[PDB]
Design a binder for this molecule. Structure first.
Ligand SMILES: *[C@@H]1O[C@H](CO)[C@@H](O[C@@H]2O[C@H](CO)[C@@H](O[C@@H]3O[C@H](CO[C@H]4O[C@H](CO[C@H]5O[C@H](CO)[C@@H](O)[C@H](O)[C@@H]5O)[C@@H](O)[C@H](O[C@H]5O[C@H](CO)[C@@H](O)[C@H](O)[C@@H]5O)[C@@H]4O)[C@@H](O)[C@H](O[C@H]4O[C@H](CO)[C@@H](O)[C@H](O)[C@@H]4O[C@H]4O[C@H](CO)[C@@H](O)[C@H](O)[C@@H]4O)[C@@H]3O)[C@H](O)[C@H]2NC(C)=O)[C@H](O)[C@H]1NC(C)=O
Ligand SMILES: *[C@@H]1O[C@H](CO)[C@@H](O[C@@H]2O[C@H](CO)[C@@H](O[C@@H]3O[C@H](CO[C@H]4O[C@H](CO[C@H]5O[C@H](CO)[C@@H](O)[C@H](O)[C@@H]5O)[C@@H](O)[C@H](O[C@H]5O[C@H](CO)[C@@H](O)[C@H](O)[C@@H]5O)[C@@H]4O)[C@@H](O)[C@H](O[C@H]4O[C@H](CO)[C@@H](O)[C@H](O)[C@@H]4O)[C@@H]3O)[C@H](O)[C@H]2NC(C)=O)[C@H](O)[C@H]1NC(C)=O
Ligand SMILES: *[C@@H]1O[C@H](CO)[C@@H](O[C@@H]2O[C@H](CO)[C@@H](O[C@@H]3O[C@H](CO[C@H]4O[C@H](CO)[C@@H](O)[C@H](O)[C@@H]4O)[C@@H](O)[C@H](O[C@H]4O[C@H](CO)[C@@H](O)[C@H](O)[C@@H]4O)[C@@H]3O)[C@H](O)[C@H]2NC(C)=O)[C@H](O)[C@H]1NC(C)=O
Ligand SMILES: *[C@@H]1O[C@H](CO)[C@@H](O[C@@H]2O[C@H](CO)[C@@H](O[C@@H]3O[C@H](CO)[C@@H](O)[C@H](O)[C@@H]3O)[C@H](O)[C@H]2NC(C)=O)[C@H](O)[C@H]1NC(C)=O
Ligand SMILES: *[C@@H]1O[C@H](CO)[C@@H](O[C@@H]2O[C@H](CO)[C@@H](O[C@@H]3O[C@H](CO)[C@@H](O)[C@H](O)[C@@H]3O)[C@H](O)[C@H]2NC(C)=O)[C@H](O)[C@H]1NC(C)=O
Ligand SMILES: *[C@@H]1O[C@H](CO)[C@@H](O[C@@H]2O[C@H](CO)[C@@H](O[C@@H]3O[C@H](CO)[C@@H](O)[C@H](O)[C@@H]3O)[C@H](O)[C@H]2NC(C)=O)[C@H](O)[C@H]1NC(C)=O
Ligand SMILES: *[C@@H]1O[C@H](CO[C@@H]2O[C@@H](C)[C@@H](O)[C@@H](O)[C@@H]2O)[C@@H](O[C@@H]2O[C@H](CO)[C@@H](O)[C@H](O)[C@H]2NC(C)=O)[C@H](O)[C@H]1NC(C)=O
Ligand SMILES: *[C@@H]1O[C@H](CO)[C@@H](O[C@@H]2O[C@H](CO)[C@@H](O)[C@H](O)[C@H]2NC(C)=O)[C@H](O)[C@H]1NC(C)=O
Ligand SMILES: *[C@@H]1O[C@H](CO)[C@@H](O[C@@H]2O[C@H](CO)[C@@H](O)[C@H](O)[C@H]2NC(C)=O)[C@H](O)[C@H]1NC(C)=O
Ligand SMILES: *[C@@H]1O[C@H](CO)[C@@H](O[C@@H]2O[C@H](CO)[C@@H](O)[C@H](O)[C@H]2NC(C)=O)[C@H](O)[C@H]1NC(C)=O
Ligand SMILES: *[C@@H]1O[C@H](CO)[C@@H](O)[C@H](O)[C@H]1NC(C)=O
Ligand SMILES: *[C@@H]1O[C@H](CO)[C@@H](O)[C@H](O)[C@H]1NC(C)=O
Ligand SMILES: *[C@@H]1O[C@H](CO)[C@@H](O)[C@H](O)[C@H]1NC(C)=O
Ligand SMILES: *[C@@H]1O[C@H](CO)[C@@H](O)[C@H](O)[C@H]1NC(C)=O
Ligand SMILES: *[C@@H]1O[C@H](CO)[C@@H](O)[C@H](O)[C@H]1NC(C)=O
Ligand SMILES: *[C@@H]1O[C@H](CO)[C@@H](O)[C@H](O)[C@H]1NC(C)=O
Ligand SMILES: *[C@@H]1O[C@H](CO)[C@@H](O)[C@H](O)[C@H]1NC(C)=O
Ligand SMILES: *[C@@H]1O[C@H](CO)[C@@H](O)[C@H](O)[C@H]1NC(C)=O
Lengths: 116, 130, 439, 116, 116, 52
């Protein structure tokens, strides 16, 4: 299929290809920048508790104001490019909520570690 | 992987004999060198073995007082193969010591089976006569 | 049994690789060692049991990086320094009253643009070439027709300081520990270091000075011992001491060229004028030549071994160049290579000093070393030779060798022959019976 | 032992030392390069689901064409240096198969949780 | 509380705030250096099997030679700054023991899985 | 069309300057040729698109 060949496919179809895109003085600056972008996303996954996973479920409920579409209307009727545009203004809210949910989980894990 | 032994030799009783075992196609130091005797009246017998790496040797109780084992320093050919030779000496030969003598090398670099005589040389005859 | 792929990380494997190396050194030198990373107070070396590895000193790219770094450091040191372009002016010269020196006078610029001053100075004849008018009284500096000339800064030392070469994390340097090694073929004793031992930059054309010594026997190294085109590197077991002197007591004077600039030159010599020279003890050198000949006979069929002086070419080729006291010497080595060795006091080498040099033989570049005042003495060890075979001959009676080599890289190879750079690859896969459990 | 001290040892014996090698203007270039080198392999582990592990079993079956060697022939009779050469032509093929298997596993675990 | 706000608090109190503090030409050097420090710490956590966690229990027993203090003397009576000074000469030893324990653990997990 | 003869002099150490010292043969103005029939077809087609 190749890199980003899934971009025009439905979100459900695209989900099978995630590993394809997971891969990959001006020259020196470019090399540092490429590293920063890689790590930027990895830090977010670590913050969310999703590190090491391609697909990570969270405890944050879907908020219907972000989108009123049904799962079939999202997963089989849209591309990821279209989906990002539909919720482009809410992505920061979602990221913050995921972090807050992880913070509560870590507090609970701490108690469990002392108990057993 | 191949082993080559010294050709057959005739000895008088009480004489010493030295048998070489040239090796090639594998790392000499990586495997144990075994010596095995075969005589029609006894069947196969273990003569013990010598490590080319540590120099450690284990002679069977029957041969501890009569058999001496030594090896040459290996000379490398490739990063994963080398040449070299093992030698065995037998003191005070008897008519009972006649028959084919074999050189053999260990099966594995590790594990419980590491010293088993996987590869054998063609073997050569020792003869004792008055 | 059903085997499955299992992933391992931290796997002890490597592959040959070329990576940028950086300098390190022990806690103004021309090599800018202050810029280098401080060395570990207790350097580590790990012996690798059961490892045999192929080395090839003639394909080694550590050498190429060292050569580029040596040139780059040299050039950086000259960037702030005074240019001598105004000194390319007609010189009027007479004999000092030896032939090696001329007493020259010329008109040179001053701090003020509209003013000029007359300068008297002594120059070595090697730095001076006659003007094509051929009157015999008019001369110019030898490189004025080929390059700009830059004066080395008097504050900058040219003394060698050992430089350790280090590799980036994820890479390692393998070292050959065999008691004798040709720099090629398989090395039985291999160990790993993050950095090399310190290597002094040494510049020489025929003899290798202050290098590593062979542990037991003389080692002769060549890419192809039968090919006369190839340069033979000989490493000695024991050093032969060479001592050098410049008997002349130079008085150094300084005259301004212009604002922010100054020119240094010898204005006078105190006492008599004598030729610079270097001596090698005859008995020690003779023993060295015999031992080298004994080793050469093992490659050449026991033909009689003949040493001879270089057949010709530039002064930089035919003589032994070196930096002594900051002065650049060129010595006649025919005193060292005149012997014939059959199967069955001191040697004085005349020298010359040249202030204008072209060390890397680059067109368009030149440097003027400032004179160093007073009498200069040096001592160093001859630790190896650069020899070439005199080929084109079918003679079975004897064989002939001459000193010298085709490149400066041949010097770097004499220390780096034992080192190899490899990349460490921590990932690997192998079959196991183990299968991943799935929720 | 020491860094790479196990390199001449058998593949099985070498496994006890994995942590030894897991750890560890031109100077700036050296530093950036070391980072790129490190991240290259960590990126693969993150995709494979093997992040945080020195030894990681997968669901990919061994294909005998890659090697017909018995486990004793591999683990008790080889160095890792020799092994890498034997499968040098198949290494990238194996890597892709691991990635495909992980993505299917991530999808299947998601579907399990959707049902439950 | 904010970044490093727990520094004067006891170690036990500080352990609550780790979530907060886990977060957060010359510019080029600054960017490279920031990356090296992030990865240096993550490399150790990955080797230890502690990746993705703020608090990670190990199988390494405490040596009374490292400290003879009771848990109460440590957790309720010390700042982390004081504690680091007390074990500054033992920290590298402890790290190596953690790494060896992780490698032995994963080897045992592999051998267990071979039985399935 | 001109066959220039190029001569050089040294400005100073490390430098040289190149200049035309003479011209061999007649001295003529430089020029270019564009095929008329190809150019006419080319602009006619461009005009057809501009009209839209
Ligand atoms: C570089 O390359 C070389 C070559 O490849 C590598 O060397 C090879 O290394 C492997 C792994 O260590 C060795 O395999 C092991 O061999 C031993 C048997 O050898 C023993 O018997 C010798 C007998 O000789 C005399 O001494 C005995 C004493 O009782 C007398 O009875 C005899 O009469 C003789 O006098 C004895 O000499 C040996 O001791 C000496 O040599 C050893 C060599 O390794 C030294 O350590 C000793 O200090 C001493 O110098 C030795 O006793 C087998 O026993 C091993 O099998 C056990 O261990 C395996 C480890 O993987 C394991 O898988 C097996 O299951 C088995 O483990 C069992 O036994 C254990 C006993 O403690 C139990 O604890 C365990 O639970 C289980 O029950 C193993 O086969 C190769 O022989 C060696 N090859 C050569 C040619 O030497 C070298 O390692 C490489 N280097 C590096 C850094 O990689
Ligand atoms: C900087 O350093 C200081 C000094 O180390 C440190 O202050 C110590 O903080 C610890 C807690 O971290 C205190 O130990 C606990 O004290 C609990 C309360 O007992 C008394 O103090 C109450 C107020 O304490 C808080 O607020 C003050 C400021 O007001 C602040 O200094 C304290 O640190 C703390 O934040 C007070 O409300 C309480 O009230 C009693 O007395 C009044 C008098 O009028 C009376 O009216 C009330 O009815 C009541 O009788 C009392 O005065 C105590 O409960 C606690 O023990 C419980 O919690 C622990 C922890 O969960 C459990 O393990 C335990 O089983 C109990 O459930 C514990 O003893 C310590 O006393 C402080 N030390 C001093 C000298 O004040 C700061 O926190 C440090 N700052 C930072 C940012 O780290
Ligand atoms: C670019 O865009 C085009 C148009 O969107 C995409 O083409 C679509 O591709 C998808 C995925 O393959 C198709 O989805 C499947 O279509 C099948 C069509 O039926 C076939 O068989 C019938 C006869 O029985 C024929 O008449 C028909 O023409 C087809 O030959 C359905 O049968 C499939 O349903 C099954 O699978 C789905 C998904 O798992 C299940 O939910 C169903 O229950 C059932 O099991 C499925 O619907 C889609 O039809 C294609 N559209 C068209 C118009 O052809 C391209 O894929 C896209 N390219 C890329 C790279 O993304
Ligand atoms: C290279 O060799 C020459 C010759 O061995 C060395 O020169 C020698 O130097 C010594 C010390 O200066 C001289 O001794 C002096 O001799 C004069 C008379 O000639 C005397 O008047 C002094 O009082 C003193 O005794 C020695 O003569 C001189 N030899 C010659 C032949 O000139 C030179 O030093 C050597 N170079 C090196 C680097 O060793
Ligand atoms: C090389 O030439 C220089 C001069 O260009 C010589 O230096 C001069 O040496 C004399 C002594 O021979 C110095 O005079 C002495 O000074 C000391 C100072 O403590 C004093 O105690 C003595 O009584 C005497 O006055 C003179 O100052 C010095 N010149 C300079 C500029 O330093 C040098 O000696 C010559 N070298 C040789 C080997 O001849
Ligand atoms: C280093 O010192 C030696 C000894 O003083 C110098 O040797 C002399 O070298 C010249 C050539 O540069 C020789 O001249 C040649 O003679 C041969 C015949 O023998 C002739 O065929 C050549 O055309 C040329 O004329 C001279 O004979 C030789 N002297 C001796 C006694 O061997 C050598 O030149 C010095 N090297 C340098 C670079 O100054
Ligand atoms: C143990 O290995 C040897 C050699 O196999 C090669 O060398 C090993 C160290 C390792 O690098 C392997 O991947 C290499 O293939 C085996 O000896 C070979 O046996 C075969 C079959 O008889 C024979 O054709 C070869 O010539 C032998 N050696 C070589 C160098 O070719 C030996 O059998 C192995 N022992 C086992 C599996 O028990
Ligand atoms: C090492 O040197 C020998 C001698 O120069 C080279 O042998 C020559 O090889 C060429 C190959 O075409 C033959 O034509 C010559 O006749 C050979 N010369 C002699 C004297 O036999 C050899 O090739 C060199 N090796 C390498 C690797 O360059
Ligand atoms: C090379 O060797 C020759 C001798 O083979 C040297 O020439 C000799 O010079 C000495 C000293 O003047 C004389 O006593 C000998 O009689 C000379 N020999 C001959 C054959 O004439 C020559 O000087 C040597 N070269 C060097 C550089 O030392
Ligand atoms: C090395 O050997 C060559 C060949 O023998 C020598 O050159 C010969 O010198 C003798 C001197 O009597 C002549 O008769 C031969 O005719 C020469 N041979 C050729 C091919 O010209 C050479 O002189 C020897 N070198 C040394 C240092 O003795
Ligand atoms: C859902 O999002 C809207 C818009 O941000 C917000 O006003 C609302 O409170 C959210 N609902 C929940 C339950 O968080
Ligand atoms: C699916 O999304 C597209 C793009 O917004 C839209 O045109 C189409 O009508 C949608 N289908 C349904 C059934 O809503
Ligand atoms: C100086 O020496 C040169 C040769 O180097 C000679 O031509 C010139 O005539 C000499 N001058 C005197 C005054 O002797
Ligand atoms: C040095 O070697 C020459 C031959 O090259 C020999 O004549 C001389 O005697 C040797 N000197 C000593 C002191 O052995
Ligand atoms: C030269 O050799 C002598 C022999 O005593 C030794 O003392 C000295 O250190 C050596 N010099 C160098 C730079 O190695
Ligand atoms: C096994 O490997 C060979 C060589 O790559 C390949 O042709 C074959 O299809 C593979 N078998 C399977 C089942 O993948
Ligand atoms: C405690 O530390 C000492 C000193 O390093 C060491 O000798 C001892 O074995 C250690 N104890 C344990 C249980 O590791
Ligand atoms: C090119 O066009 C001009 C009119 O613009 C016309 O006169 C001329 O004949 C044309 N040339 C050709 C070759 O048709």
């Amino acid at each position: 299929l190749g890199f980003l060949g899934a971009a025009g496919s439905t979100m459900g179809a695209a989900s099978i290809t995630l590993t394809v895109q997971a891969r990959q003085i001006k020259q020196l600056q470019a090399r540092v920048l490429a590293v920063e972008h890689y790590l930027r996303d990895q830090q977010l996954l670590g913050i969310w508790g999703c590190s090491g996973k391609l697909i990570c479920c969270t405890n944050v409920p879907w908020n219907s104001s972000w989108s009123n579409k049904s799962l079939d209307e999202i997963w089989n009727n849209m591309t990821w490019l279209q989906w990002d545009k539909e919720i482009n203004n809410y992505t920061q809210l979602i990221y913050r909520l995921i972090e807050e949910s992880q913070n509560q989980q870590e507090k609970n894990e701490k108690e469990l570690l002392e108990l057993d | 992987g191949q082993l080559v032994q010294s050709g057959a030799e005739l000895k008088k009783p009480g004489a010493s004999v030295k048998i070489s075992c040239k090796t090639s196609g594998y790392r000499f130091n990586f495997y144990h060198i075994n010596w095995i005797r075969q005589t029609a009246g006894r069947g196969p017998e273990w003569m013990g073995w010598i490590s080319p790496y540590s120099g450690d040797k284990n002679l069977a109780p029957a041969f501890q007082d009569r058999v001496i084992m030594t090896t040459d320093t290996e000379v490398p050919v490739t990063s994963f193969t080398s040449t070299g030779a093992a030698y065995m000496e037998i003191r005070n030969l008897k008519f009972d010591d006649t028959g084919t003598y074999f050189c053999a090398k260990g099966l594995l670099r590790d594990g419980s089976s590491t010293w088993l005589p996987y590869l054998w040389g063609q073997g050569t005859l020792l003869t004792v006569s008055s | 049994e059903n085997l499955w792929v299992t992933v391992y990380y931290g796997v002890p494997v490597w592959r040959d690789a070329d990576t940028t190396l950086f300098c390190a050194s022990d806690a103004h030198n021309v090599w800018a060692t202050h810029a280098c990373v401080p060395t570990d107070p207790n350097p580590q070396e790990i012996h690798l049991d059961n490892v045999t590895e192929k080395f090839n000193m003639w394909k080694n790219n550590m050498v190429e990086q060292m050569h580029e770094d040596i040139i780059s450091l040299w050039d950086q040191s000259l960037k702030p320094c005074v240019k001598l372009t105004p000194l390319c002016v007609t010189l009027h010269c007479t004999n000092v009253t030896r032939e090696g020196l001329k007493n020259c006078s010329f008109n040179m610029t001053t701090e003020l643009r509209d003013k000029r001053q007359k300068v008297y100075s002594l120059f070595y004849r090697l730095d001076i070439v006659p003007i094509n008018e051929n009157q015999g009284s008019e001369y110019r500096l030898i490189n004025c027709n080929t390059s700009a000339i830059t004066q080395a800064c008097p504050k900058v030392s040219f003394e060698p300081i050992p430089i350790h070469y280090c590799t980036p994390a994820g890479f390692a340097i393998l070292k050959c520990k065999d008691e004798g090694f040709n720099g090629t073929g398989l090395c039985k004793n291999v160990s790993t270091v993050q950095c090399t031992h310190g290597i002094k930059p040494v510049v020489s054309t025929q003899l290798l000075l202050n290098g590593s010594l062979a542990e037991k026997n003389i080692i002769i190294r060549s890419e192809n011992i039968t090919n006369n085109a190839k340069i033979i590197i000989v490493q000695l077991v024991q050093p032969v001491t060479i001592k050098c002197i410049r008997p002349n007591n130079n008085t150094v004077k300084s005259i301004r060229i212009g604002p922010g600039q100054a020119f240094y030159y010898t204005g006078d010599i105190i006492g008599d004028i004598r030729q610079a020279h270097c001596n090698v003890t005859r008995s020690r050198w003779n023993k060295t030549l015999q031992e080298v000949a004994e080793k050469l006979r093992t490659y050449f069929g026991n033909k009689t071994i003949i040493f001879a002086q270089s057949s010709g070419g530039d002064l930089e080729i035919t003589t032994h160049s070196f930096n002594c006291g900051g002065e650049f010497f060129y010595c006649n080595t025919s005193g060292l290579f005149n012997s014939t060795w059959y199967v069955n006091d001191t040697i004085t080498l005349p020298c010359r000093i040249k202030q204008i040099i072209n060390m890397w033989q680059r067109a368009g570049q030149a440097m003027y070393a400032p004179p160093i005042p007073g009498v200069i003495k040096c001592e160093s060890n001859i630790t190896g030779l650069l020899l070439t075979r005199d080929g084109g001959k079918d003679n079975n009676v004897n064989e002939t060798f001459r000193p010298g080599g085709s490149d400066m890289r041949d010097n770097w190879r004499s220390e780096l022959y034992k080192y190899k750079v490899v990349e460490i690859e921590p990932l690997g896969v192998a079959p196991t019976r183990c299968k991943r459990r799935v929720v």
